Write an enzyme that holds these catalytic residues in place. Structure first.
Site, PDB file in Angstrom:
ATOM      1  CG  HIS A  75     -20.518  64.141  75.161  1.00  0.00           C
ATOM      2  ND1 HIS A  75     -20.020  65.348  74.727  1.00  0.00           N
ATOM      3  CD2 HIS A  75     -21.306  63.682  74.159  1.00  0.00           C
ATOM      4  CE1 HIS A  75     -20.437  65.581  73.495  1.00  0.00           C
ATOM      5  NE2 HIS A  75     -21.234  64.592  73.133  1.00  0.00           N
ATOM      6  CG  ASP A  99     -17.814  67.037  76.736  1.00  0.00           C
ATOM      7  OD1 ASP A  99     -17.559  65.855  77.105  1.00  0.00           O
ATOM      8  OD2 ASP A  99     -18.703  67.303  75.868  1.00  0.00           O
ATOM      9  N   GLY A 155     -23.711  63.195  66.323  1.00  0.00           N
ATOM     10  CA  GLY A 155     -22.577  62.382  65.949  1.00  0.00           C
ATOM     11  C   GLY A 155     -21.380  63.165  65.465  1.00  0.00           C
ATOM     12  CB  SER A 157     -19.544  65.796  69.899  1.00  0.00           C
ATOM     13  OG  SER A 157     -19.489  64.401  70.129  1.00  0.00           O
TER      14      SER A 157
HETATM   15  C1  LIG Z   1     -32.179  73.689  74.393  1.00  0.00           C
HETATM   16  O1  LIG Z   1     -31.209  73.313  75.353  1.00  0.00           O
HETATM   17  C2  LIG Z   1     -29.876  73.302  74.889  1.00  0.00           C
HETATM   18  O2  LIG Z   1     -29.636  73.449  73.742  1.00  0.00           O
HETATM   19  N1  LIG Z   1     -28.781  73.118  75.846  1.00  0.00           N
HETATM   20  C3  LIG Z   1     -27.481  72.763  75.335  1.00  0.00           C
HETATM   21  C4  LIG Z   1     -27.445  71.235  75.277  1.00  0.00           C
HETATM   22  O3  LIG Z   1     -27.677  70.577  76.231  1.00  0.00           O
HETATM   23  N2  LIG Z   1     -27.146  70.610  73.974  1.00  0.00           N
HETATM   24  C5  LIG Z   1     -27.141  69.168  73.849  1.00  0.00           C
HETATM   25  C6  LIG Z   1     -28.158  68.833  72.757  1.00  0.00           C
HETATM   26  C7  LIG Z   1     -28.231  67.296  72.472  1.00  0.00           C
HETATM   27  C8  LIG Z   1     -29.111  67.070  71.201  1.00  0.00           C
HETATM   28  C9  LIG Z   1     -28.240  66.621  70.002  1.00  0.00           C
HETATM   29  C10 LIG Z   1     -27.230  67.734  69.607  1.00  0.00           C
HETATM   30  C11 LIG Z   1     -26.499  67.320  68.305  1.00  0.00           C
HETATM   31  C12 LIG Z   1     -25.162  67.212  68.229  1.00  0.00           C
HETATM   32  C13 LIG Z   1     -24.269  67.479  69.454  1.00  0.00           C
HETATM   33  C14 LIG Z   1     -22.830  67.739  69.008  1.00  0.00           C
HETATM   34  C15 LIG Z   1     -23.104  66.836  70.210  1.00  0.00           C
HETATM   35  C16 LIG Z   1     -22.952  65.364  69.765  1.00  0.00           C
HETATM   36  O4  LIG Z   1     -22.971  65.069  68.416  1.00  0.00           O
HETATM   37  N3  LIG Z   1     -22.794  64.430  70.588  1.00  0.00           N
HETATM   38  S1  LIG Z   1     -22.641  62.874  69.902  1.00  0.00           S
HETATM   39  O5  LIG Z   1     -23.799  62.552  69.091  1.00  0.00           O
HETATM   40  O6  LIG Z   1     -21.505  62.764  69.011  1.00  0.00           O
HETATM   41  C17 LIG Z   1     -22.507  61.699  71.287  1.00  0.00           C
HETATM   42  C18 LIG Z   1     -23.606  61.693  72.367  1.00  0.00           C
HETATM   43  C19 LIG Z   1     -21.833  60.376  70.940  1.00  0.00           C
HETATM   44  C20 LIG Z   1     -21.077  61.429  71.754  1.00  0.00           C
HETATM   45  N4  LIG Z   1     -23.023  67.121  71.640  1.00  0.00           N
HETATM   46  C21 LIG Z   1     -24.029  66.648  72.593  1.00  0.00           C
HETATM   47  O7  LIG Z   1     -24.929  65.954  72.283  1.00  0.00           O
HETATM   48  C22 LIG Z   1     -23.836  67.198  74.023  1.00  0.00           C
HETATM   49  C23 LIG Z   1     -23.643  66.115  75.179  1.00  0.00           C
HETATM   50  C24 LIG Z   1     -24.306  66.903  76.330  1.00  0.00           C
HETATM   51  O8  LIG Z   1     -23.543  68.137  76.520  1.00  0.00           O
HETATM   52  C25 LIG Z   1     -22.468  67.952  77.393  1.00  0.00           C
HETATM   53  N5  LIG Z   1     -22.241  66.671  78.002  1.00  0.00           N
HETATM   54  C26 LIG Z   1     -21.105  66.528  78.921  1.00  0.00           C
HETATM   55  C27 LIG Z   1     -20.854  65.152  79.578  1.00  0.00           C
HETATM   56  C28 LIG Z   1     -19.671  65.000  80.527  1.00  0.00           C
HETATM   57  O9  LIG Z   1     -19.442  63.771  81.131  1.00  0.00           O
HETATM   58  C29 LIG Z   1     -20.311  62.741  80.738  1.00  0.00           C
HETATM   59  C30 LIG Z   1     -18.740  66.176  80.836  1.00  0.00           C
HETATM   60  C31 LIG Z   1     -18.997  67.531  80.180  1.00  0.00           C
HETATM   61  C32 LIG Z   1     -20.199  67.689  79.215  1.00  0.00           C
HETATM   62  N6  LIG Z   1     -20.431  68.998  78.589  1.00  0.00           N
HETATM   63  C33 LIG Z   1     -21.552  69.148  77.685  1.00  0.00           C
HETATM   64  C34 LIG Z   1     -21.840  70.491  77.010  1.00  0.00           C
HETATM   65  C35 LIG Z   1     -25.481  67.239  75.791  1.00  0.00           C
HETATM   66  N7  LIG Z   1     -25.005  67.754  74.299  1.00  0.00           N
HETATM   67  C36 LIG Z   1     -25.778  68.657  73.393  1.00  0.00           C
HETATM   68  O10 LIG Z   1     -25.360  68.976  72.345  1.00  0.00           O
HETATM   69  C37 LIG Z   1     -26.375  73.334  76.231  1.00  0.00           C
HETATM   70  C38 LIG Z   1     -24.973  72.900  75.731  1.00  0.00           C
HETATM   71  C39 LIG Z   1     -26.624  72.816  77.663  1.00  0.00           C
HETATM   72  C40 LIG Z   1     -26.460  74.884  76.190  1.00  0.00           C
END
Ligand SMILES: COC(=O)N[C@H](C(=O)N[C@H]1CCCCC/C=C\[C@@H]2C[C@@]2(C(=O)NS(=O)(=O)C2(C)CC2)NC(=O)[C@@H]2C[C@@H](Oc3nc4cc(OC)ccc4nc3C)CN2C1=O)C(C)(C)C
Ligand SMILES: [Zn+2]
EC number: 3.4.22.-
Length: 197
Positions: A75, A99, A155, A157
């Protein structure tokens, strides 16, 4: 057809320094040079360490070397190449279902070793070099001992979860948030990486 663009490469722009007693972020390339390096795919900067800070034109996140592969999240990276001294380098692993993506680890990087401890007391390393205690709660879940706003984790991940001995247990994938507070994290277990390999 004539004007169709190409997406740039992922670019290493810094690292999380874990070499000593104090963890701290270091920037190794600024925003302008990042943009240029993303377009050419040619990055001659020296790479060091296990946890890199990486950027595209639109996002910034982390990447972690484990067993000679630099891993991060799909992602963040999509299918992008990574910039390297000799030009862009194609992913050697891509798995949208997990992911997960990976490239051959850059020369100069150091790799973490996959954990075989079977231990549930973990540590998450963020892009700000915070080391966050996490109790493992399942195959791909851990709880923060001290919850924090999701802003704190954004940021990060692609960063590692480590065991007490400093082995890699997983790659941080997503936060589990209630009313904006991260009480738990979702991670790609190192065994899924080892399988992918
Ligand atoms: C209350 O509901 C919830 O909690 N629900 C939870 C939920 O949705 N959490 C969301 C909260 C989002 C708020 C901020 C959370 C803070 C930090 C977070 C560590 C990071 C991150 O830092 N990113 S980042 O900033 O570096 C960035 C953006 C530059 C890269 N990660 C994400 O942001 C991931 C991306 C997407 O997750 C997936 N996207 C994909 C996409 C794909 O192809 C495009 C393929 C597989 C895939 N698999 C996935 C599981 C949503 N997300 C979440 O964390 C769950 C996980 C659903 C239970
Ligand atoms: Zn271990």
């Amino acid at each position: 057809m004539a004007s169709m663009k190409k997406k740039g490469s992922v670019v290493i722009v810094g690292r999380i320094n874990l070499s000593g007693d104090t963890a701290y972020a270091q920037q190794t390339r600024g925003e302008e040079g990042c943009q240029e390096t993303s377009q050419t795919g040619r990055d001659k900067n020296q790479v060091e360490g296990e946890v890199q800070i990486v950027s595209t034109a639109t996002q910034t996140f982390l990447a972690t070397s484990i067993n000679g592969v630099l891993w991060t999240v799909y992602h963040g990276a999509g299918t992008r190449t990574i910039a390297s001294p000799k030009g862009p380098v194609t992913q050697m692993y891509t798995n949208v279902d997990k992911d997960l993506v990976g490239w051959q680890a850059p020369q100069g990087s150091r790799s973490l070793t996959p954990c075989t401890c079977g231990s549930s007391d973990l540590y998450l390393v963020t892009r700000h070099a915070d080391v966050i205690p996490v109790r493992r709660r399942g195959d791909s879940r851990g709880s923060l001992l001290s919850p924090r706003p999701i802003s704190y984790l954004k940021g990060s991940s692609g960063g590692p979860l480590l065991c007490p001995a400093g082995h890699a247990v997983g790659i941080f994938r997503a936060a589990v948030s209630t009313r904006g507070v991260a009480k738990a994290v979702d991670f790609i277990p190192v065994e899924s990486l080892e399988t992918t390999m």
